[PDB]
Design a protein around this ligand. Structure first.
Ligand code: HEM
Ligand SMILES: O=C(O)c1ccc(OC(F)(F)F)cc1
Ligand SMILES: [Cl-]
Length: 393
């Protein structure tokens, strides 16, 4: 009843061009079995959305990577939010929601926008730049560590640590094994920065620790919640902004529409998140036997959700393979859906908006002018290098 496929969604060939295999996964059936890793897969929008929105049946506390925490030791102590189910999930989630709230966004928006404008002005002086290292990486590095309250020393550990976290959700392939082999110095740095004395006043980290007297979290929960922001808060935005710039570079007609109305910046970023889906995949684990799209899945089974495939499913989207900055993007699953839906989405959207606004106002053309190099990661989709020429407006 359930089709069995040999596709390895964590192979370099798949990462290099996932779209044919993602159509094969969608068209084989609503539920497939991936023989390579002994997991179920759902690649259509309908089933991905259904799984995300039944956290009781499709839980997160047994891990959202391939590894089942009931069978293996987690590579690091479980996240108190990402790798927790209700009710344990609920109060840590509420704390992060209030730490990354609209009021916080109002306090940081002016500085984030000034840094975006400054970066684009700087890049225009150089003309030919690498849109990854010099923009998608450089801009988040210029605002987010400071917004966390991190000291300057050791920030070079942040992107390596994030690459490790996202590789570690994958199966035990070479990408994951190599990441873990090199992890010790990055874990040491990150864990140390999570302690209250090491987080500067008024930043996200200090605000988490300040919430430890309301009865929502205790002081011993705050370091791991800081760890969540140091795991998820930087490399995601790097690949979100990189996706948006890559989209504008490939689709000059959409850059031209964005220039003509810079208030489309926020939706142009949201559409880039749908179109590229920088966070490609997450797993759930079934807590009971369950019927999903005509399939009977037993208890204790891993289910792989293809978020990027769901965001390209023609059953849900018109012209899914087109980048359209005025698309009605509401409902895409690039930030997830339901109780775990990205708690940092207001930070991600703020960064993406102000960067695309700066480009819209200052840049007339974005032309790829060198070899494009892809970066391979078990969970993240994005580029290693994107050489572009920026023409000033
Ligand atoms: C374009 C940028 C981003 C994308 C595409 C993205 C994607 C996602 C997705 C798909 C989830 C759902 C995980 C699941 O269902 O298991 C999630 C959750 C989460 N994200 Fe984001 N994220 C981004 C930026 C950020 C930022 C900037 C932060 C923090 C500053 C952040 C922190 C988190 C946390 C802590 C969770 C776990 C929430 C929970 O389990 O309740 N993310 N993200
Ligand atoms: O809590 C954490 O450590 C954590 C780590 C990664 C993560 O990934 C993404 F969902 F994509 F943002 C979310 C949360
Ligand atoms: Cl760690």
């Amino acid at each position: 009843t359930i089709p069995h496929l040999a596709i390895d969604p964590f192979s370099l060939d798949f990462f290099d061009d996932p779209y044919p295999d993602q159509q094969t996964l969608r068209d084989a059936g609503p539920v497939v079995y991936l023989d390579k890793w002994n997991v179920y897969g759902v690649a259509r929008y309908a089933e991905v959305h259904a799984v995300l929105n039944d956290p009781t049946t499709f839980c997160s506390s047994r891990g959202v990577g391939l590894s089942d925490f009931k069978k293996e030791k987690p590579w690091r102590p479980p996240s108190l939010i990402l790798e927790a189910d209700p009710p344990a999930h609920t109060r840590p989630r509420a704390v992060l929601s209030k730490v990354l709230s609209p009021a916080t966004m109002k306090t940081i928006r002016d500085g984030f926008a000034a840094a975006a404008d400054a970066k684009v002005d700087e890049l225009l002086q150089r003309g030919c730049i690498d849109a990854i290292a010099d923009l998608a990486e450089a801009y988040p590095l210029s605002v987010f560590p400071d917004a966390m309250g991190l000291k300057q020393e050791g920030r070079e550990h942040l992107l390596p640590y994030a690459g490790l976290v996202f590789n570690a959700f994958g199966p035990p392939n070479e990408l994951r094994q190599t990441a873990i082999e090199r992890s010790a110095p990055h874990q040491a740095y990150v864990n140390e920065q999570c302690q209250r004395p090491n987080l500067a006043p008024g930043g996200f980290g200090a605000c988490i620790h300040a919430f430890t007297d309301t009865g929502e979290i205790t002081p011993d929960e705050a370091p791991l919640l800081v760890r969540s922001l140091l795991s998820a808060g930087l490399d995601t935005t790097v690949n979100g902004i990189g996706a948006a710039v890559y989209c504008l570079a490939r689709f000059p007609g959409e850059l031209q529409r964005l220039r003509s109305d810079p208030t489309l910046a926020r939706n142009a970023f949201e559409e880039a998140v749908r179109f590229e889906s920088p966070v490609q995949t997450f797993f759930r684990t079934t807590t009971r036997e369950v019927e999903l799209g005509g399939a009977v899945i037993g208890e204790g089974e891993k289910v792989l959700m293809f978020l990027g495939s769901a965001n390209r499913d023609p059953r849900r989207w018109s012209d899914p393979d087109l980048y359209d900055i005025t698309r009605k993007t509401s409902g895409h699953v690039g930030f997830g859906s339901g109780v775990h839906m990205c708690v940092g989405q207001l930070v991600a959207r703020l960064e993406g908006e102000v960067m695309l606004s700066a480009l819209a106002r200052k840049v007339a053309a974005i032309d790829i002018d060198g070899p494009v190099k892809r970066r391979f990661n078990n969970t993240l989709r994005g580029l290693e290098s994107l050489p572009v020429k920026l023409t000033p407006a």
